[PDB]
Amino acid sequence: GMQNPVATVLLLQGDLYCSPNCLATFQDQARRDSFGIQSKVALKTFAAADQREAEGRDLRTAYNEIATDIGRSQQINENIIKYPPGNHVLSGGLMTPFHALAHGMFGLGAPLTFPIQNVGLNVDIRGIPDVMNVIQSARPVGTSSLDVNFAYDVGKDSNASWLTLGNITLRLVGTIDKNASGAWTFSGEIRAFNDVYDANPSNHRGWLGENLTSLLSAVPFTSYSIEIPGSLPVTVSGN
Ligand SMILES: [Ca+2]
Ligand SMILES: [Cl-]
């Protein structure tokens, strides 16, 4: 099998970590070794696997391949997988909040990218009064412009992404075509402002739970910026 027991345990735990049981299983591991080697190596593997999912790979395949590669070493220390130095990208998948968590403890404060299309937004503008108020403000019949920003609870769409981002600020930018009737169409795009990730584990207590938050309170962290590049084209109409 593997050249070491850390990789062996990773492969054994694949069915649980690459599932909805990931958090509970990781909490149990962290409790067992006091956020020790196996826990740190698991967390780094999650971040690596998420990175690979962001690049187009299958999560479980990516996870298994990283564990297998760790398995080529006879060593068992926490550096048998290194948190890489370059451009980290969040996939929006199962392991994304773990990747963000990993980044606060291993990423040296470097910015991370969360492509807007990976977040899982499904913004219903008609459900946002401050935006609808601006839409339906003093406008000429014909074409006019809209460019406004609004807070958004990402949990409206993805409890998961929420674990990483919480609230963010979105920008709606485009043009409105309106009738002499008062019927209108908006065509444009949603963009997102950068989000500060506060890597203090007390900010993550609800998700991480009592024991893990306690264990991580002892570990150094550096907060960082999450860049949320790109645009989501959208169309909205009303009266
Ligand atoms: Ca936020
Ligand atoms: Cl070793």
CA geometry: angle 11, 27, 22, nearest 5 deg: 50
Q: Which helix (H) or strand (E) holds 210?
A: helix 210-216
Among residues 50, 165, 159, which one has the least CA distance to residue 116? 165
Centre of ligand 1 to C-alpha 150, Å, is 13
1-87 in CATH: which number? 1.10.150.790
Which ligand is nearest to the Cα of residue 196, counting in written order?
1
Between the CA of 17 and the centroid of ligand 2 the distance, in Å, is: 24
What residue spans define the domains of the chain? 1-87, 88-239
Phi, psi angle pair for 202, to nearest 5°: -65, -25
Q: Is 167 annotated as a binding residue?
A: yes
In the chain, DSSP finds a helix count (H) and a strand count (E) of 11, 7
- Residue 195 assigned ligand-binding role: yes
Beta bridge partners of 21: none
| CB-count burial class (<10 Å; 0-12, 13-18, 19+) for 189 | middle
What fold does the segment set 88-239 form as a domain? Beta-Lactamase (3.30.450)
Pick the ligand that lies closest to the CA of residue 78: 2
CA of 195 to the centre of ligand 1 (A): 5
Q: How far is the CA of 153 from the centre of ligand 1 (A)?
A: 9
Between the CA of 199 and the centroid of ligand 2 the distance, in Å, is 29
Unique residue bearing structure tokens 């690049």: 55
What are the backbone dihedrals phi and psi of residue 129, each rounded to the nearest 5 degrees, phi first?
-60, -45
Which ligand has its closest atom nearest to the C-alpha of 3? 2
**5-12 vs 37-54: helix axis angle to the nearest 10?**
60
Way the structure was solved: X-ray
CA angle, corner 22, sides to 16 and 28, nearest 5? Answer: 90
138 SS3 class: coil
Burial class of 96 by CB neighbour count within 10 A (0 to 12, 13 to 18, 19+): buried
Judge if 1-87 and 88-239 fold alike in CATH terms: no
Resolution in A: 1.5
96 alpha carbon – ligand 1 mean position (Å): 15
Angle between helices 37-54 and 96-106 in degrees, nearest 10: 120
Q: Give every CB contact of residue 176 below 8 A, 6+ residues apart in sequence.
A: 135, 139, 143, 144, 145, 146, 184, 185, 186
Rg (CA), the chain: 22
